[PDB]
Design a protein around this ligand. Structure first.
Ligand code: AGS
Ligand code: AGS
Ligand code: AGS
Ligand code: AGS
Ligand code: AGS
Ligand code: CL
Ligand code: CL
Ligand code: MG
Ligand code: MG
Ligand code: MG
Ligand code: MG
Ligand code: MG
Lengths: 546, 722, 196
């Protein structure tokens, strides 16, 4: 029942790194003495609350069978003056005595927050005490100091120097696959009903971490209990095993649990492999292949580019009318490469405090650098361009993104994609060679694509046989992909109204589409098109006078 | 299971001698709503009551007032054995006596005041040893049945001779008081108090079962809400109702003591609470102990926070203790307390709505003899920004007014007033209006979350928009089955746009009423009012308030005022609102409506698919609709039969609903002139309407209309080149 | 020569309100013990300097005949950490002993200013000390805590909660009538010329 690597999900790659760093020095202490080579001193774990940092630390302890001294942050800082530093000493001393050992400083930010942030002396002194104890590991007596924090920044940078906490591991929020994993770990002991689709749970559970899912499984269970409780006994101090087995956790119980679901970490910049594919995008076949040659090749065939003497381009700019699949393409190519993907929307960049707006863009480019191969996607750039002239802060952010672009070495597998519905006000700086020099024009869908889009959106929907999507495409000439989805949504909304009113079983049929087309609208004017067509050629010249 | 076993639930019938069984069970036991039953609880004690029917009451549960519940020595969520009792017959004599601490202050004729009207024609089925409660004379007295003649149980028919032995009796040890706080003393917190009851009842009442299951129970329950919302009340109520040990940690009291004494008291608190498990540690005014660590300089203060955190993490003991805490401000609390294993559960105990206030008023008028002219529903209705404590003060002040005036001569020189006077003393509706005049509402500035009182009937015309609105909000809530079977996810938000005064704000509220869903209205200027630094963390607070109040509709009214202010601060707000919209998961039933009298300057970002993509155009009203508006406005007014509302609509074929409302007022303002100047039979007739119509008012020019119709067809195209 | 309502002018309405709130609870203390209703606890008086707040407090005390314990803000906060909190306890204790009484905390903002402005552990402790004492009156002894401040928005909001300083009186600057009224009170001992 104790903790082990089998009790951890979503942290596959990270848990592998920690294993590599720690296994040799711990399982083979004698060997490492003989080599003379230097092992890792400190391992810092960061990530939002409830991602399983304390868990992994306690897991690595039992699995390596190393001596384990837990240093609770809040516990130290709750004690008196010298007793704090005195306990820090004992913790190291006792750990060194029973080597090999792992000292785990949980909630490190409590002990050693920003040495400038802290007010007083006894606090600063405790930080100094820690820095000495870390440096005091020059005895090297096979001790590994692990630590956990939610504030990777608030930790006094002195701790992240070489010889102290020199290695770090981003145990971030889990993705769709990771959440499924954790759900299985906590539903491991439950008798799940057959209608329970944990895959569905994991997918509509966007902003949950390990602690959230653990509580979510606990929630669905306690509700299923309270039901068949009904009569039970209660007066009896204990329930027998016979009853507990007959107990089943329905999918409904999980849905009730998902109702009270308060996701811990939302807007926490997500880093995952998009579930969007080429199949979700109608048309653009030429651009799709072009995206591969830019992203697929340099990562899967570095030997070619090195032998050809050319270095690949860094970034791409999607520009064209609104709702033509610019966001989709960005996610699509990342999925094709099965590379990580980060989407920062323009407004998200204009949200931050003025001071944070610089230190947080660095966090992004660092998160992309570490999650390599990765597709860093700056979507909705138009909303930023407007905030500069009115077509202050937006100025500082873009200049930061430019600096961060140049600084990132081309030999890294990070690929930057920018997108905007408006190339008439895009900063020319972004378009200069070495930045987003690959200017891709994504226009309104041609007739062939419109059919593909219609089928793509009505894929999972019950459309009648007599419905002619090809004719429908023939009628919606100047319409965008977003519009065609809305027409489908409009037509589907009518079919639902009929279902409730008459109970005719769900069939979105012909006359539903016909009326939806009656009210249909063109979200991109002719004049707008002519402009986009001009920028499809002359956007190259926007860095001159223009 | 035999039918004779049921579980104790709260009481709908506030009467003492009564229980409530569902009709399916009622007829199952073959015992009828009129008959007298015998209740057998734990501790081998009994009580007698009249059984009745509840449609809401689930068959397996039995509703009984706290008084009966106390006599049985039972709590909410325990089993009792009911059985018919035809053995009971009419009473000959009864020997009741008041309990000492429930009469300390008054003296006189308790029979005439309390006992006589309490048993008057009441044929109450009592029992020997029972303790009942009588409310009157601005207090509640407890009597205990010492003896009956058809003992131990008998009925109190009008011929029954009620004896009073002589002197008040002392309180028994195991006998709790009814003056103590309970769920029956809390109103307006139906939903919130339900949640807390679910969180707390299982681990506390049946701790052994939670030890056996292995599942993790809630550790910390943080209560927030403005001052006087009844956070301390709810905490103290759950303690007495679940019967758990209660250790109160008062914030200021700790922090008022010396450095180490504060931390030492924290230990002793958790120590004694753990010792006397099951228990509830209530940390009242938590922000006094654990404000943001950045917000606090000094050393000791930071050390005290750390001490609390360690104690909170010390629930690895899991010796069945629940740490409740109350603060008037979540963001003041050190976020380190919000982490899992500490205060991981939260309950927003906000300000009460109209119905909730009426409830509270009924709770604090329990012991007073209200005059017949008193309409508490009116008091509640005209009490926008009061909180639980404000209303409790309102009733208390209205009482003090009735007192001090009908004091008149009294005696004063006499150290105490007898029960005869206090009962005869009544609180007039006048006294409430006087108390309402000196009303100092605590939470006016607080953003409100409640079900709008506006309905479709208040909106003339727009029948098309009403129906489309029902599809967008009501269907996805009331019929998730269809949407999942069709494979489409609904749209999240709507944008109302059109000329001024055509019912955009009404529609936003009206739909929330149709769905009986919560409603939040943040007007443009409210957003531009906010302090810049806090502006962002407060917008986040809104979306959290709407997320928790789900199903809710978040209404951003008067967006044009923000669009003007952009072309600095106005930029950061919207860009964050756009950010918060995206974060709003479609499955949360939070539906965001936007409104603006100016579509020529909306940030097209708001109109992006996924955001406010449903662009509904609300124009000036056509003739049919204008009549509906005129009737809707004159609905509550005494109009003459001679008035031709139709003709009034014929002439004004360019007037907004805001104009027609102003015209109806103007004509009324003239009718009031006549009523005051000449005392004429008060009624708004024609010649007011005609004169008010002569001067006229066109709040929307012709050129304005042309533009609005142009945007009605081209607004979706504002995301490209403008 | 002692202060009374006749020594106060320009505050007719305010003085009436204070008369209502205060008058019944002291010579009806056994009555309130009999009724069970909750009377006011803290009456906060605010207005610019020299408006008559300290005057009105002392007047109400002498006119009602209640015991009067004056707590001068600066006087407390002039003493050492021990004395400050100690004198606060002594005042509330001796006031409860000689009930009915009025504890007047003059220049309250000196003791419990906006907590955001406050620094140092001792000062924050004194505020908490006062909050506990105010909550201590929920024993429902026959005691009223009047308090004066030149700046209402300077007071720590903790004091304005229910059960503490829950009632307030805006004793503002006098108008033309009020000034005439006050002038009469200060010229009532002087022989005025006819041209005056
Ligand atoms: N990756 C995970 N896999 C399985 N369970 C997890 C995971 N992460 C969290 N949990 C569960 O959530 C709980 C979180 O425990 P912790 O190890 O304390 O997480 P934590 O990150 O250290 O919390 P913080 O950062 O101190 S708030 C664990 O006890 C698990 O039950
Ligand atoms: N090529 C397409 N195939 C299928 N659906 C599309 C396509 N293009 C647009 N859509 C629809 O439009 C939505 C948005 O796609 P996006 O990639 O965001 O287009 P966009 O260029 O970014 O334009 P906006 O301003 O974000 S709507 C998708 O969710 C689809 O519903
Ligand atoms: N929800 C309520 N229902 C009925 N009465 C209430 C309610 N809330 C407050 N009251 C009355 O007002 C009093 C104040 O209750 P409190 O619990 O002290 O409010 P509070 O939220 O704890 O105030 P704080 O947090 O100390 S500022 C109660 O004793 C009741 O008399
Ligand atoms: N269809 C209507 N039915 C009844 N009253 C209406 C109607 N339309 C407008 N009004 C009146 O106009 C007033 C304003 O209603 P709103 O919904 O706020 O209109 P609006 O579109 O928001 O325009 P403004 O900017 O608020 S005046 C209300 O007080 C109503 O009395
Ligand atoms: N309404 C008044 N009527 C007559 N005299 C007044 C009045 N108000 C103030 N005074 C005079 O002002 C002096 C006392 O004022 P105080 O009450 O001590 O000032 P204050 O209101 O307490 O303001 P601060 O904060 O102490 S400077 C005496 O001389 C009073 O006679
Ligand atoms: Cl730009
Ligand atoms: Cl805008
Ligand atoms: Mg942890
Ligand atoms: Mg997009
Ligand atoms: Mg309280
Ligand atoms: Mg409006
Ligand atoms: Mg003074």
């Amino acid at each position: 029942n104790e903790v082990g690597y089998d009790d951890i999900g979503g942290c596959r790659k990270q848990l592998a790194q920690i294993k590599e760093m720690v296994e040799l020095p711990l399982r083979h202490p004698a060997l490492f003495k003989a080599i003379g080579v230097k092992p890792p001193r400190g391992i810092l774990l960061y990530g939002p609350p409830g991602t399983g940092k304390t868990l992994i630390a306690r897991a690595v302890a039992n699995e390596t069978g190393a001596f384990f001294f837990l240093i609770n942050g809040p516990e130290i800082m709750s004690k008196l003056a010298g007793e704090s530093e005195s306990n820090l000493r004992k913790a190291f001393e006792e750990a060194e005595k029973n080597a090999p050992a792992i000292i785990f400083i949980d909630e490190l930010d409590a002990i050693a927050p920003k040495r400038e942030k802290t007010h007083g002396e006894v606090e600063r002194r405790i930080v100094s005490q820690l820095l000495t104890l870390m440096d005091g590991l020059k005895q090297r007596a096979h001790v590994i100091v692990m630590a956990a924090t939610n504030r990777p920044n608030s930790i006094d940078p002195a701790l992240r120097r070489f010889g102290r906490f020199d290695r770090e591991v981003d145990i971030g929020i889990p993705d769709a696959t990771g959440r499924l994993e954790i759900l299985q770990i906590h539903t491991k002991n439950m008798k799940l009903a057959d209608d329970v689709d944990l895959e569905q749970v994991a997918n509509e559970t966007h902003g949950h971490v390990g602690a959230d899912l653990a509580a979510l499984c606990s929630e669905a269970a306690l509700q299923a209990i309270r039901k068949k409780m009904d009569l039970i006994d209660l007066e009896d101090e204990t329930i027998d095993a016979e009853v507990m087995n007959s107990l089943a956790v329905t999918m409904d119980d999980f849905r009730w649990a998902l109702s009270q679901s308060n996701p811990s970490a939302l807007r926490e910049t997500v880093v995952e492999v998009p579930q969007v594919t080429w199949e979700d995008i109608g048309g653009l076949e030429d651009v799709k292949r072009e995206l591969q040659e830019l992203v697929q090749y340099p990562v899967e065939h570095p030997d070619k580019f090195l032998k050809f003497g050319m270095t690949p381009s860094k970034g791409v700019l999607f520009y064209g009318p609104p709702g033509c699949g610019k966001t989709l393409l960005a996610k699509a190519i990342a999925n094709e490469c099965q590379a990580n993907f980060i989407s920062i929307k323009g407004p998200e960049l204009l949200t931050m405090w003025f001071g944070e707006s610089e230190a947080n863009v660095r966090e992004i480019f660092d998160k992309a650098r570490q999650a390599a191969p990765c597709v860093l996607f700056f979507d909705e750039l138009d909303s930023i361009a407007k905030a500069r002239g009115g077509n202050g802060a937006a100025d500082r952010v873009i200049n930061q993104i430019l600096t961060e672009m140049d600084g990132m070495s081309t030999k890294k597998n990070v690929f930057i994609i920018g997108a905007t519905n408006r190339p008439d006000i895009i900063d020319p700086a972004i378009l200069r060679p070495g930045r987003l020099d690959q200017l891709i024009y994504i226009p309104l869908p041609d007739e062939k694509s419109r059919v593909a889009i219609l089928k793509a959106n009505l894929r999972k929907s019950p459309v009648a046989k007599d419905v002619d999507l090809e004719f429908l495409a023939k009628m919606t000439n100047g319409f965008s992909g977003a519009d065609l989805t809305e027409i489908c949504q409009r037509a589907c909304k009518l079919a639902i109204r009929e279902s409730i009113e008459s109970e005719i079983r769900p069939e979105i049929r012909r006359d539903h589409f016909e009326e939806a087309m009656r009210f249909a609208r063109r979200s991109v004017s002719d004049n707008d098109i002519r402009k986009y067509e001009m920028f499809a050629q002359t956007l190259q010249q926007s860095r001159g006078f223009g | 299971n035999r039918p004779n076993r049921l579980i104790v639930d709260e009481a709908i019938n506030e009467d003492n001698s009564v229980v409530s069984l569902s009709q399916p069970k009622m007829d199952e036991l073959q015992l009828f709503r009129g008959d007298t039953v015998l209740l057998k609880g734990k501790k081998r004690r009994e009580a007698v009551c009249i059984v009745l029917s509840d449609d809401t009451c689930s068959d397996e549960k039995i509703r009984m007032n706290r008084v009966v519940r106390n006599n049985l020595r039972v709590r909410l969520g325990d089993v009792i054995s009911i059985q018919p009792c035809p053995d009971v017959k009419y009473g000959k004599r009864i020997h009741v006596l008041p309990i000492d601490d429930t009469v300390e202050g008054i003296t006189g004729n308790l029979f005439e005041v309390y006992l006589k009207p309490y048993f008057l024609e009441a044929y109450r089925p009592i029992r020997k040893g029972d303790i009942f409660l009588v409310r009157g004379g601005m207090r509640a007295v407890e009597f205990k049945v010492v003896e009956t003649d058809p003992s131990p149980y008998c009925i109190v028919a009008p011929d029954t001779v009620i004896h009073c032995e002589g002197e008040p009796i002392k309180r028994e040890d195991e006998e709790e008081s009814l003056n103590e706080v309970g769920y029956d003393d809390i109103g307006g917190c139906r939903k919130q108090l339900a949640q807390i009851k679910e969180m707390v009842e299982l681990p506390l009442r049946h701790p052994a079962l939670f030890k056996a299951i292995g599942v993790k129970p809630p550790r910390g329950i943080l209560l927030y809400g403005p001052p006087g919302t009844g956070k301390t009340l709810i905490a103290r109520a759950v303690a007495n109702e679940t019967g758990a040990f209660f250790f109160l940690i008062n914030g200021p009291e700790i922090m008022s003591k010396l450095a180490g004494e504060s931390e030492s008291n924290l230990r002793k608190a958790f120590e004694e609470a753990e010792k006397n498990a099951p228990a509830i540690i209530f940390i009242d005014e938590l922000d006094a102990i654990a404000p943001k660590r950045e917000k606090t300089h000094g050393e000791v203060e930071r050390r005290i926070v750390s001490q609390l955190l360690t104690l909170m993490d010390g629930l690895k003991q899991r010796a069945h203790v629940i740490v409740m805490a109350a603060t008037n401000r979540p963001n003041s609390i050190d976020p380190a307390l919000r982490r899992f294993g500490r205060f991981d559960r939260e309950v927003d105990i906000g300000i009460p709505d109209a119905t909730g206030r009426l409830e509270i008023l009924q709770i604090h008028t329990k012991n007073m003899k209200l005059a017949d002219d008193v309409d508490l529903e009116q008091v509640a209705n005209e009490t926008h920004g009061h909180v639980g404590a404000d209303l409790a003060a309102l009733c208390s002040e209205a009482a003090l007014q009735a007192i001090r005036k009908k004091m008149d001569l009294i005696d004063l020189e006499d150290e105490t007033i007898d029960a005869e006077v206090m009962n005869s003393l009544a609180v007039t509706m006048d006294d409430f209006r006087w108390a309402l005049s000196q009303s100092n509402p605590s939470a006016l500035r607080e953003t409100v979350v409640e079900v709008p009182q506006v309905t479709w009937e208040d909106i003339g015309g727009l029948e098309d928009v009403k129906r489309e609105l029902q599809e967008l909000v009501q269907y996805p809530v009331e019929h998730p089955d269809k949407f999942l079977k069709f494979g489409m996810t609904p749209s999240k938000g709507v944008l109302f746009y059109g000329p001024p005064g055509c019912g955009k704000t009404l529609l936003a509220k009206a739909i929330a009423n149709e769905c009986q869903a919560n409603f939040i209205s943040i007007k443009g200027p409210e957003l531009l009012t906010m302090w810049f630094g806090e502006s962002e963390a407060n917008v986040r607070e809104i979306f959290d308030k709407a997320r928790q109040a789900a199903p809710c509709v978040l209404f951003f009214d008067e967006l044009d005022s923000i669009a003007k202010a952009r072309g600095g601060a106005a930029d950061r707000v919207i860009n964050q609102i756009l950010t918060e919209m995206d974060g709003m998961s479609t499955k949360k039933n939070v539906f965001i409506i936007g409104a603006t009298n100016r579509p020529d300057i909306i940030d097209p970002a708001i109109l992006r698919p996924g955001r406010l993509d449903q662009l509904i155009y609300i124009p000036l009203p056509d003739e049919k609709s204008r009549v509906a508006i005129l009737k809707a406005n004159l609905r509550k007014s005494p109009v003459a039969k001679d008035v031709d509302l139709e003709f009034l609509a014929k002439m004004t074929n360019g007037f907004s609903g805001a104009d027609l409302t102003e015209i109806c007022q103007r004509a009324c303002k003239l009718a009031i002139r006549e009523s005051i100047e000449s005392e004429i039979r008060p009624e708004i007739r024609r010649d007011h309407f005609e004169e008010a119509m002569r001067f006229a008012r066109r709040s929307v020019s012709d050129n304005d209309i042309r533009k609005y119709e142009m945007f009605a067809q081209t607004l979706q195209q504002s995301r490209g080149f403008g």
